[PDB]
């Protein structure tokens, strides 16, 4: 009922797993207004996440809508490797990585396309992704939001918005919703 633990990989922090997954920062040119989904809001960290969800990310959308068959796994991939997990509360299948063991048991996991750090018990339903979907960059890019009450932004999560990219240090953005 519980998955076999990762055989390898380097355990990382919440901050380091964001920096070690593949992100396409060229999709957010500085001093440009771009359209992207408000992936998630993290008021405690005073940051948000935006996701292009391009036509190039179409296969991730197919997996999200459960329109693609996947091979179920009984063994957890290495720490930092990208696979898929079934969220049956929302009945979606989302890309996920395990970044570290958890001090209270389980694992610290990161949903790379939402920008959400979650707890992973170890008995979840997980799938292997095809190599082309696994290699696609993480859609969620972290942003400091200016001219913005981040607390108010929860109403725009999972919704397309327009943001003006003030700064792009190729890790996180300084952007403003317009």
């Amino acid at each position: 009922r519980f998955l076999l633990p990762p055989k390898g990989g380097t355990e990382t922090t919440r901050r380091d797993i964001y920096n070690q997954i593949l992100k396409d920062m060229a999709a957010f040119p500085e001093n440009t207004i771009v359209t992207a989904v408000l992936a998630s809001v993290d008021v405690t960290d005073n940051c948000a996440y935006v996701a292009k969800w391009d036509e190039s990310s179409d296969r991730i959308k197919k997996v999200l809508q459960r329109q693609l068959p996947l091979q179920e796994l009984d063994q957890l991939p290495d720490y930092g490797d990208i696979f898929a997990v079934l969220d049956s509360i929302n009945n979606i299948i989302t890309r996920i990585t395990i970044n570290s063991s958890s001090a209270g048991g389980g694992y610290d996991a990161y949903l790379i396309d939402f920008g959400e750090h979650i707890h992973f018990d170890g008995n979840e339903t997980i799938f292997k992704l095809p190599d082309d979907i696994k290699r696609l960059p993480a859609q969620a890019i972290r942003c400091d939001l200016i001219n913005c009450d981040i607390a108010n932004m929860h109403c725009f999560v999972n919704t397309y918005i327009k943001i003006r990219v003030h700064e792009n240090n190729n890790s996180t953005l300084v952007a403003e919703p317009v």
């Binding site: 989904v37 929302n90 979606i92």
Partner: peptide, 11 residues
């Protein structure tokens, strides 16, 4: 709906 809303955003 939560994350399910994203489906309606990407359909």
């Amino acid at each position: 709906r939560g994350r399910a809303r994203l489906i309606d955003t990407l359909k």
